[PDB]
Amino acid sequence: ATKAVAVLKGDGPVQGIINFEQKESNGPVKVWGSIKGLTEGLHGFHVHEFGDNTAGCTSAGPHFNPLSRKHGGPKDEERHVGDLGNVTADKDGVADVSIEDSVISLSGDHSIIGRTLVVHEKADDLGKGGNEESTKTGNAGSRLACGVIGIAQ
Amino acid sequence: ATKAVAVLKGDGPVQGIINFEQKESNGPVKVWGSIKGLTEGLHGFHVHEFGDNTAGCTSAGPHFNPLSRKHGGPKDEERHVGDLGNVTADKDGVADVSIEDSVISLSGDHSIIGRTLVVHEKADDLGKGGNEESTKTGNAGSRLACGVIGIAQ
Numbered sequence: 616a617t618k619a620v621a622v623l624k625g626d627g628p629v630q631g632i633i634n635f636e637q638k639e640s641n642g643p644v645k646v647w648g649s650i651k652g653l654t655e656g657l658h659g660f661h662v663h664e665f666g667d668n669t670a671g672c673t674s675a676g677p678h679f680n681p682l683s684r685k686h687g688g689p690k691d692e693e694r695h696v697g698d699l700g701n702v703t704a705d706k707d708g709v710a711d712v713s714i715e716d717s718v719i720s721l722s723g724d725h726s727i728i729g730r731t732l733v734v735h736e737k738a739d740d741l742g743k744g745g746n747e748e749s750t751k752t753g754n755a756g757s758r759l760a761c762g763v764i765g766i767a768q
Numbered sequence: 769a770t771k772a773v774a775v776l777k778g779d780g781p782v783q784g785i786i787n788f789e790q791k792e793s794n795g796p797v798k799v800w801g802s803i804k805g806l807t808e809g810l811h812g813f814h815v816h817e818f819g820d821n822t823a824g825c826t827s828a829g830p831h832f833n834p835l836s837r838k839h840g841g842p843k844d845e846e847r848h849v850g851d852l853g854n855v856t857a858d859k860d861g862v863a864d865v866s867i868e869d870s871v872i873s874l875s876g877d878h879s880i881i882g883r884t885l886v887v888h889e890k891a892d893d894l895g896k897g898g899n900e901e902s903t904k905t906g907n908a909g910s911r912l913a914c915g916v917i918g919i920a921q
């Protein structure tokens with residue numbers, strides 16, 4: 616697809632709509648939208664492997680990692696395909712997301728279509744935390760809201 | 769994908785979980801699960817083009833129709849790829865779903881992954897209604913519940 620979208624919902628107040636657009640079938644993917652109800656500051660933001668919401672965000676599984684690498688920040692060569700880093704919420708609890716990434720795609724082997732977008736409780740340490748958890752989840756904490764990434768127009 | 773799942777939700781009591789499994793990429797897809805909160809009787813069941821829930825089921829667009837054909841029953845040669853017919857709710861408002869279809873697929877250029885599964889208010893006349901609306905939606909009425917089809921473990 617050339618456009619995708621995910622509606623974020625959780626058990627708390629966190630909610631929002633994130634759009635994805637890929638101009639060329641292989642080019643970078645632009646990610647933008649608004650998320651409200653968040654605490655001010657950094658919040659982990661990743662694409663998880665499964666688009667399964669049968670048990671809330673918990674059933675989405677781990678980070679989308681088709682190349683079986685360690686967790687990292689989006690700028691790192693060593694990272695999960697789904698590692699989009701952090702998004703920042705302002706004093707009013709709003710995160711006006713604006714990310715561009717060349718690793719995720721809306722088609723092919725690294726396609727995030729049908730997978731789950733998740734926004735976390737805490738900041739993602741981008742794999743620089745020094746413990747095993749950092750190399751897996753970035754120590755971003757619980758999943759506050761998530762949504763299945765679907766094809767859009 | 770080999771497995772997929774859709775969690776149906778709407779503005780009313782209608783909700784459910786529908787599983788998808790395709791043993792081989794060129795094989796048929798098994799669809800099964802249950803939906804509750806329905807009025808006894810037949811209810812339209814189709815895959816709509818967009819996995820866009822920004823406006824609830826309303827933003828899902830029309831029936832997935834990559835081959836540009838007229839609406840029909842799942843067993844009709846002439847039909848939308850997304851046409852899965854009707855599910856049947858019992859006296860307790862529960863419809864137990866068990867279907868096998870060889871038109872829809874969970875992979876390939878025309879995969880239903882990332883699109884929307886919708887359950888309708890009324891019965892799908894399978895495109896035999898005799899009117900123009902029948903050849904489009906099958907007169908299935910409003911969209912009671914829907915969910916984005918996501919990749920499952």
Ligand SMILES: [Cu+]
Nearest residue numbers: 659660661733
């Ligand atoms: Cu995550």
Ligand SMILES: [Cu+]
Nearest residue numbers: 812813814886
């Ligand atoms: Cu439909």
Ligand SMILES: [Zn+2]
Nearest residue numbers: 678686695698
């Ligand atoms: Zn990761």
Ligand SMILES: [Zn+2]
Nearest residue numbers: 831839848851
């Ligand atoms: Zn149709």
